[PDB]
Amino acid sequence: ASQVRQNYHEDCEASINKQINMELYASYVYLSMAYYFERDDVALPGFAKFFKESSDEEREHAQTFMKYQNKRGGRIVLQQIAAPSMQEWGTGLEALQAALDLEKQVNQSLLELHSTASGNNDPHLTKLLEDEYLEEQVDSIKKIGDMITKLKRAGPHGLGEYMFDKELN
Amino acid sequence: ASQVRQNYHEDCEASINKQINMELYASYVYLSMAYYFERDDVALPGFAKFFKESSDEEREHAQTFMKYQNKRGGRIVLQQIAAPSMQEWGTGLEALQAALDLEKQVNQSLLELHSTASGNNDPHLTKLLEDEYLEEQVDSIKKIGDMITKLKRAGPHGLGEYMFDKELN
Amino acid sequence: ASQVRQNYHEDCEASINKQINMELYASYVYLSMAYYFERDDVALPGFAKFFKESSDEEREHAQTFMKYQNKRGGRIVLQQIAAPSMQEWGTGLEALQAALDLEKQVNQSLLELHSTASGNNDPHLTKLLEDEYLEEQVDSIKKIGDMITKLKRAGPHGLGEYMFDKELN
Amino acid sequence: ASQVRQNYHEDCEASINKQINMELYASYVYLSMAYYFERDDVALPGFAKFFKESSDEEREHAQTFMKYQNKRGGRIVLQQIAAPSMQEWGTGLEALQAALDLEKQVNQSLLELHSTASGNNDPHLTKLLEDEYLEEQVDSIKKIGDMITKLKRAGPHGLGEYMFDKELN
């Protein structure tokens, strides 16, 4: 084992590698969306900016887990990153609904990892998840829910979509 | 009696305690509205801010009356604060209409207290009400009336509600 | 359910509503004390300031729970706020002893909520309680205990009460 | 009559001259107290400062009434200023108790003048009294009451009198 490893279970190590892949995949989905909203026939620069920022945040979350793996003496194992499930994401609303679903999937995975850490009596890892992942994920979910409500109000097509896009920009 | 008490009638003292309770209740109604408009399925941050500010103002008015009670040598008696009449407040417009009604109820109570003070020849208290309560109350009622008109114009649902909410934020 | 709700148990949601009511009640008790200590026949401005600050902190803690309820997709339900148990609070020491007792009651309620959250495997809520509630509550209890000891030393009546009041102001 | 006089009754004019004399007398009492507390065998510089300030305030109130008399076209008539009722004022507490009594006497006179103005339908004069006299008088009475309570606490003789005197200085 690593000279640093202490109280770090192999199941937690493996689950962290899975989470790294999931965050990189989410990053890729959001990168896809960011550039979809910059197509000449879409031209929603607020949505584009929102998804570019989201993409960067997910990549940063993957990097934090990679740093964490090394901190604990586990070994990073990187796997293929799947293509995003779509190439075209539809309306602003459809992309936000897809984002909400993705953020809830990621949250579920993080909560499962917390359960694994808790079951293996790893309080350093439960603390990391609580402070660095679970809080950001709930805030992201609340933010996207609010945005969906606001966009539905502003009436999710036409002038309302145009105006809502300005508040993101 | 208090060493400070002079020309301060028991009916005025009692009415001031009633007014403290009414202002705290109004504060509580507006607090309820403020967080209703921050629900993920409502997401009207301008309305939320407006009602949070209104809540703070009503609490400050209650505190000013508590300080006044002590200044005159009366004794503050605090009673239960009723639950707000609703848990969910409907549309932006419905909440403003409820607020207008509440502000008029509070104004009527203040005007009754002015009449009690005047009838007991208490010019210190009539001055307090005129300067610190009645003017703010009329301004509040005018402001909410204007807001209702503006929201009805901007057409009180959908995009217009979304846009009006921005002017409050 | 809310579009945002995930891993949020109805018992936790209900317990948060109870905690909101308890914090608003504590706020009301401390507001009562703040103005009691500004009576002309009491005139302890340090104690008044201490209890006004405490009142504001408890109100802010209620608001943080209201924001939290919305963040998780639960629904705020507001109830009547009871009158403070007293209208007159006795000596500085008696008010501090009442405050200590109240702060321990609140702490017990928070610890019960932590137990409920832990039992429902809600690490987002256990983290909130640990970081935003339980630490502040232990610090408040230690501070009030220290103050009680200091006031008993300064000999809890007369000149000593007068001098101790200055350190709060 | 004066070229400026309008809606100004002779009874109000006369009562204002009486009030000028009363405020000058109060000023003289407080001047007496201020220098009593600077005797070598008294040496309470906080009390001295407090009464010197009170003396100046009462003189300023007399001057405001003199200016008011001229503003309305009445004619100032100045009378003898009585010697203060005492040459030696006893303890700090006895002087504050004498001051409270004097401030209540002055308040009663002002309230009588308000009643005279109101009865003669003189709203310019009722406004003056409310804004420039009655509010300051209530604040003064509250302040002196608080001081009496604080001094009785700090235990009105000996070390406590010495320490209370510092908060005034």
Side-chain angles (χ1 to χ4, degrees):
Chain A
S2 179
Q3 72 193 320
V4 304
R5 195 191 192 115
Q6 185 172 27
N7 194 41
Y8 193 53
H9 194 292
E10 63 178 15
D11 290 351
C12 296
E13 174 181 3
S15 183
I16 288 176
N17 283 330
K18 178 177 84 256
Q19 196 66 43
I20 290 162
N21 189 261
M22 195 182 197
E23 305 268 2
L24 290 174
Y25 170 76
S27 185
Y28 201 24
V29 169
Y30 291 146
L31 188 70
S32 179
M33 290 180 179
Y35 286 84
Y36 168 79
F37 285 111
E38 192 258 321
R39 290 165 50 160
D40 76 271
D41 63 353
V42 179
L44 284 160
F47 284 87
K49 185 158 106 82
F50 174 79
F51 286 121
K52 179 69 189 353
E53 290 174 342
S54 298
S55 177
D56 292 338
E57 294 186 72
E58 293 300 319
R59 176 191 57 273
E60 289 161 359
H61 295 160
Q63 288 172 0
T64 295
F65 271 131
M66 293 169 77
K67 176 179 192 77
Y68 186 85
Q69 188 76 280
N70 282 340
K71 191 185 298 269
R72 294 298 302 276
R75 290 296 165 246
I76 297 159
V77 177
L78 296 173
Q79 302 289 350
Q80 187 219 85
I81 307 165
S85 54
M86 304 297 297
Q87 302 296 335
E88 306 187 289
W89 297 97
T91 62
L93 177 59
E94 283 168 327
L96 291 177
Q97 288 168 325
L100 179 59
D101 290 342
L102 181 53
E103 292 289 310
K104 290 179 110 181
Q105 287 173 344
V106 169
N107 197 32
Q108 179 61 29
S109 184
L110 291 165
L111 286 168
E112 287 169 5
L113 178 47
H114 188 282
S115 178
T116 296
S118 182
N120 288 123
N121 304 114
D122 189 338
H124 184 277
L125 178 48
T126 61
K127 177 231 201 305
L128 170 86
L129 293 165
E130 290 163 23
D131 288 355
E132 299 295 327
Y133 291 90
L134 295 176
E135 259 202 356
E136 276 161 347
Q137 206 67 17
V138 156
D139 287 343
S140 287
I141 290 163
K142 174 63 159 68
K143 182 174 299 150
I144 294 163
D146 290 353
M147 290 167 65
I148 287 166
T149 297
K150 291 173 173 177
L151 175 56
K152 286 180 172 181
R153 177 184 288 105
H157 310 298
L159 179 59
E161 184 185 48
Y162 174 81
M163 292 307 301
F164 175 80
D165 177 79
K166 292 194 183 320
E167 102 168 60
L168 259 31
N169 212 359
Chain B
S2 177
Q3 71 191 324
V4 303
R5 194 192 191 115
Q6 187 171 25
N7 194 40
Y8 193 51
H9 194 289
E10 63 182 13
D11 289 351
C12 296
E13 173 181 7
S15 183
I16 287 172
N17 285 328
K18 174 180 83 258
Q19 199 62 46
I20 289 159
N21 188 261
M22 194 183 197
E23 305 266 5
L24 291 174
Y25 170 76
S27 186
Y28 199 25
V29 169
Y30 292 144
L31 186 70
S32 176
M33 293 181 179
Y35 286 86
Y36 169 78
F37 285 112
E38 292 197 342
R39 289 167 51 163
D40 77 270
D41 61 354
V42 180
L44 284 162
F47 285 85
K49 184 152 108 84
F50 174 79
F51 287 119
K52 178 63 156 276
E53 291 173 338
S54 297
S55 177
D56 291 337
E57 275 279 61
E58 292 303 317
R59 177 184 65 267
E60 290 162 357
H61 296 158
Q63 289 172 357
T64 296
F65 272 128
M66 293 170 77
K67 179 179 180 205
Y68 187 85
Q69 189 75 281
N70 283 339
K71 192 187 296 276
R72 293 301 299 279
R75 293 295 165 243
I76 298 159
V77 178
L78 295 173
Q79 304 287 348
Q80 295 184 198
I81 306 162
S85 54
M86 305 292 285
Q87 302 297 335
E88 310 185 289
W89 295 98
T91 64
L93 177 60
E94 283 166 329
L96 291 179
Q97 291 170 323
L100 179 58
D101 292 341
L102 178 56
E103 293 288 311
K104 292 180 109 179
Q105 287 173 345
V106 168
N107 197 33
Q108 180 59 28
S109 184
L110 290 166
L111 288 166
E112 286 169 6
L113 178 47
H114 190 282
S115 176
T116 297
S118 181
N120 289 123
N121 304 115
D122 189 339
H124 186 276
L125 177 48
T126 59
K127 179 241 202 296
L128 170 85
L129 292 166
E130 291 163 24
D131 288 355
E132 301 296 326
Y133 293 91
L134 297 175
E135 255 190 2
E136 269 169 289
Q137 208 63 19
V138 158
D139 287 347
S140 286
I141 290 164
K142 175 61 159 68
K143 183 180 293 157
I144 293 163
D146 289 352
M147 289 166 65
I148 288 167
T149 296
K150 291 172 169 179
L151 178 55
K152 283 178 175 183
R153 180 185 284 105
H157 307 299
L159 180 56
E161 183 185 52
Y162 172 83
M163 297 302 303
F164 175 83
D165 176 81
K166 299 286 196 46
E167 98 167 65
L168 253 34
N169 211 358
Chain C
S2 179
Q3 72 193 320
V4 304
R5 195 191 192 115
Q6 185 172 27
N7 194 41
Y8 193 53
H9 194 292
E10 63 178 15
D11 290 351
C12 296
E13 174 181 3
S15 183
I16 288 176
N17 283 330
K18 178 177 84 256
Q19 196 66 43
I20 290 162
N21 189 261
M22 195 182 197
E23 305 268 2
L24 290 174
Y25 170 76
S27 185
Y28 201 24
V29 169
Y30 291 146
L31 188 70
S32 179
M33 290 180 179
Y35 286 84
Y36 168 79
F37 285 111
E38 192 258 321
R39 290 165 50 160
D40 76 271
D41 63 353
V42 179
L44 284 160
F47 284 87
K49 185 158 106 82
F50 174 79
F51 286 121
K52 179 69 189 353
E53 290 174 342
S54 298
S55 177
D56 292 338
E57 294 186 72
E58 293 300 319
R59 176 191 57 273
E60 289 161 359
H61 295 160
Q63 288 172 0
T64 295
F65 271 131
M66 293 169 77
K67 176 179 192 77
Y68 186 85
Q69 188 76 280
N70 282 340
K71 191 185 298 269
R72 294 298 302 276
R75 290 296 165 246
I76 297 159
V77 177
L78 296 173
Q79 302 289 350
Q80 187 219 85
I81 307 165
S85 54
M86 304 297 297
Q87 302 296 335
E88 306 187 289
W89 297 97
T91 62
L93 177 59
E94 283 168 327
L96 291 177
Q97 288 168 325
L100 179 59
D101 290 342
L102 181 53
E103 292 289 310
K104 290 179 110 181
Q105 287 173 344
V106 169
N107 197 32
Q108 179 61 29
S109 184
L110 291 165
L111 286 168
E112 287 169 5
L113 178 47
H114 188 282
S115 178
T116 296
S118 182
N120 288 123
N121 304 114
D122 189 338
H124 184 277
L125 178 48
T126 61
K127 177 231 201 305
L128 170 86
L129 293 165
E130 290 163 23
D131 288 355
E132 299 295 327
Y133 291 90
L134 295 176
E135 259 202 356
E136 276 161 347
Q137 206 67 17
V138 156
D139 287 343
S140 287
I141 290 163
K142 174 63 159 68
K143 182 174 299 150
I144 294 163
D146 290 353
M147 290 167 65
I148 287 166
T149 297
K150 291 173 173 177
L151 175 56
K152 286 180 172 181
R153 177 184 288 105
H157 310 298
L159 179 59
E161 184 185 48
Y162 174 81
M163 292 307 301
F164 175 80
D165 177 79
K166 292 194 183 320
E167 102 168 60
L168 259 31
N169 212 359
Chain D
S2 177
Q3 71 191 324
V4 303
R5 194 192 191 115
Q6 187 171 25
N7 194 40
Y8 193 51
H9 194 289
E10 63 182 13
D11 289 351
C12 296
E13 173 181 7
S15 183
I16 287 172
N17 285 328
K18 174 180 83 258
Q19 199 62 46
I20 289 159
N21 188 261
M22 194 183 197
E23 305 266 5
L24 291 174
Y25 170 76
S27 186
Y28 199 25
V29 169
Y30 292 144
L31 186 70
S32 176
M33 293 181 179
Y35 286 86
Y36 169 78
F37 285 112
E38 292 197 342
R39 289 167 51 163
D40 77 270
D41 61 354
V42 180
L44 284 162
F47 285 85
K49 184 152 108 84
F50 174 79
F51 287 119
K52 178 63 156 276
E53 291 173 338
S54 297
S55 177
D56 291 337
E57 275 279 61
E58 292 303 317
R59 177 184 65 267
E60 290 162 357
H61 296 158
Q63 289 172 357
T64 296
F65 272 128
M66 293 170 77
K67 179 179 180 205
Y68 187 85
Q69 189 75 281
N70 283 339
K71 192 187 296 276
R72 293 301 299 279
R75 293 295 165 243
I76 298 159
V77 178
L78 295 173
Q79 304 287 348
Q80 295 184 198
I81 306 162
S85 54
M86 305 292 285
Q87 302 297 335
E88 310 185 289
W89 295 98
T91 64
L93 177 60
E94 283 166 329
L96 291 179
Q97 291 170 323
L100 179 58
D101 292 341
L102 178 56
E103 293 288 311
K104 292 180 109 179
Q105 287 173 345
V106 168
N107 197 33
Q108 180 59 28
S109 184
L110 290 166
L111 288 166
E112 286 169 6
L113 178 47
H114 190 282
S115 176
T116 297
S118 181
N120 289 123
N121 304 115
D122 189 339
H124 186 276
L125 177 48
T126 59
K127 179 241 202 296
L128 170 85
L129 292 166
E130 291 163 24
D131 288 355
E132 301 296 326
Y133 293 91
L134 297 175
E135 255 190 2
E136 269 169 289
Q137 208 63 19
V138 158
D139 287 347
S140 286
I141 290 164
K142 175 61 159 68
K143 183 180 293 157
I144 293 163
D146 289 352
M147 289 166 65
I148 288 167
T149 296
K150 291 172 169 179
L151 178 55
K152 283 178 175 183
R153 180 185 284 105
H157 307 299
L159 180 56
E161 183 185 52
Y162 172 83
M163 297 302 303
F164 175 83
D165 176 81
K166 299 286 196 46
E167 98 167 65
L168 253 34
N169 211 358

